[PDB]
Amino acid sequence: MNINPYFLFIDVPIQAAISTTFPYTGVPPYSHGTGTGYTIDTVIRTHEYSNKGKQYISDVTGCTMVDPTNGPLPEDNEPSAYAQLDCVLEALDRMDEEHPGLFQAASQNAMETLMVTTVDKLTQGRQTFDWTVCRNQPAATALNTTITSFRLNDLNGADKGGLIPFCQDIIDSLDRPEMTFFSVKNIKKKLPAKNRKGFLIKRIPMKVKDKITKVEYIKRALSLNTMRAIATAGIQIRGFVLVVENLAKNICENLEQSGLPVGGNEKKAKLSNAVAKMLSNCPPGGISMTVTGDNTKWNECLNPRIFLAMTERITRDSPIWFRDFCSIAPVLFSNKIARLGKGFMITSKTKRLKAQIPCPDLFSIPLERYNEETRAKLKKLKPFFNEEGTASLSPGMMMGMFNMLSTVLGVAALGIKNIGNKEYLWDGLQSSDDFALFVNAKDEETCMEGINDFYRTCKLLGINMSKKKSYCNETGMFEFTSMFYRDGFVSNFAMELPSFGVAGVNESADMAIGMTIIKNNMINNGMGPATAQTAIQLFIADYRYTYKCHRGDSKVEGKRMKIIKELWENTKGRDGLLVADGGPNIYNLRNLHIPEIVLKYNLMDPEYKGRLLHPQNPFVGHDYDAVSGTHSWRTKRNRSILNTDQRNMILEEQCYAKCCNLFEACFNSASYRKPVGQHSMLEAMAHRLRMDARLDYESGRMSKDDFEKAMAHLGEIGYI
């Protein structure tokens, strides 16, 4: 009997059968390498779909620029980035007329939020491209480095605290003839280390001051570095994109078509409501069709100039300063420069050699030495390449940075609802990459005529529908963002599942975080009761393994398990003991939002309650919900190097190695005989030698003459 798993589809609808095909909503490790080649291909494709536009030379950054907007309309079904401004303006006009007082209110709310916001908001983000060092650093570190450089350059926006002064100082820094900043430089090492020679070589960083001309800083600020996001943007762009996205979110929240920022069962409600609404107003005897459309090269076709036009149209009645503030982001994106990453690698098999060619030296060697695909890619990329290992890139959107504005543009495309006053009405939903289109007509022929008209219209707006990944069927069954809807039933394609291990804070905190994660997964991603209970079981298993807190009545052995077993033997209320103390777990679906301390309080032993919740215990000392007890301990978090200046100047003197060598013998002869606790190493040596001489004389290793000589020298030391 040869199994055939696909045969399940015979007895089960495919929508349910393929539920949760991918356990991971993130990124796999085996995805096609996103290196210099991938970014080169991305820029090549971005410039390829817009090569019929206007090509010119930027007078600021001196880089090639391509502008496809208002360019010739496509004559082929291939992707096109030529979005006419008039069509976009008309679509925005239609949206505004349909929703009176929407753009004004959204712009007002966005500007008020910007006025009340603070620079600290910029720290909530993923890896950010720091320009001072030209790398990827955490948001907080990047913001701190930018602030320090601004202070060095007589720019103190962060001092005022507001975000508006910070962005004003950013755009002012874009005007300084020379920009001075701090940078980190690594220098080799010569300090001792015991492997076989008491000598090792490493890298130590130091802070230095570096200055850059105006054009260099201008190019650096617009740079987009690469680490399914393809690149990250520095700090000079973060505030403006934040404001523009807040505006777009304010607009979208009141757009019934927008599929964002819906999350949870609200998504299912929106899907079913849209289907029901479209079916209700279907013409008597007409036909309703549904397209699960997808967009190819979504972010490689949208143009920053079109986003600038959308921002200008939306904020047509708003203070001029806010209009400029909103416009600062699209103009920055329209001049974005991509960084190609590390570079390539070329090898010689005959001599068994290999080397890494960095981006600036990409063209330093004949193209014949690159494989076919890289040769062609470099040949095509030559015009859009800079001498500093960067590529000019005017068009494109390099994945998600204006997702809300993309959704707004898609909703505008969906809001036309008719072309030529034909016998079809279209509508649907769209969330920043994917759209579901519902069209009502008389016969399927007119429905497909309407679908064709919608395809042409979105082409006019620069949105390219995917013919190779889209299909149409009678309304009632479709998909929308990995969520299959079928005549009321709803299923998910990919659902994130709890990862192995505890959260990584502490016993009570880890338990609370795990339970709240399970609860959130149930609420949002739609995890069934049995799956949630199994997740609880797995989390308990992992927690017990990590904290070595198996059941008190178990037969396992461990350093902590002996005390756990003794406590279990001495305790009467064994149902009230916490899991961390080998007690029984009692968590279930109905009580996934209650801390275990509160759950078990009524069953705890009063003596155990006092010991556990002692107001002054030595462990606690000085989101999720838990109880502050003896299980809220803190782990030692102290590493790296402090006292950097003193340590560096000491290590750079000379005699440190001799001190280490003298220390090593005596204080390694025994595993631990160090009077540690801030004792000066000289004092510890004096005490150690005094004790060694005492022991030598007592055992007879030394005569009285050597004894007295040693004490004489020890007397001369100063600690005797």
Partner: protein
């Protein structure tokens, strides 16, 4: 030999730099250089705590009468340490201590 170490220490003290570094730098500071010399930071918090718990004294401890109330040893099991720590500026306690 005690005398050999003594004479070597005197010879080293003849030089000013060695005398200064020995007078100022403490035994606690001696460990720090070795750490960065052959140690650095890690990631993956879930596994980080897994490694930390298996160690002897991963838990920070407060200073006070209650901290000293718990013993150093218990049925052949260590609980805390006497010598002061650098980072926390206080004692460090083993996981079992909490259970105690």
């Amino acid at each position: 030999m005690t005398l050999a170490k003594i004479e070597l220490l005197k010879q080293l003290l003849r030089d000013n730099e060695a005398k200064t570094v020995l007078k100022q730098t403490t035994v606690d500071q001696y460990n720090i250089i070795r750490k960065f010399n052959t140690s650095r930071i890690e990631k993956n918090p879930s596994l980080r705590m897994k490694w930390a718990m298996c160690s002897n004294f991963p838990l920070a401890l407060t200073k006070g009468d209650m901290a000293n109330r718990i013993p150093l040893e218990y049925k052949g099991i260590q609980l805390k340490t006497n010598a002061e720590d650098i980072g926390t500026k206080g004692q460090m306690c083993s996981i079992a201590a909490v259970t105690w």
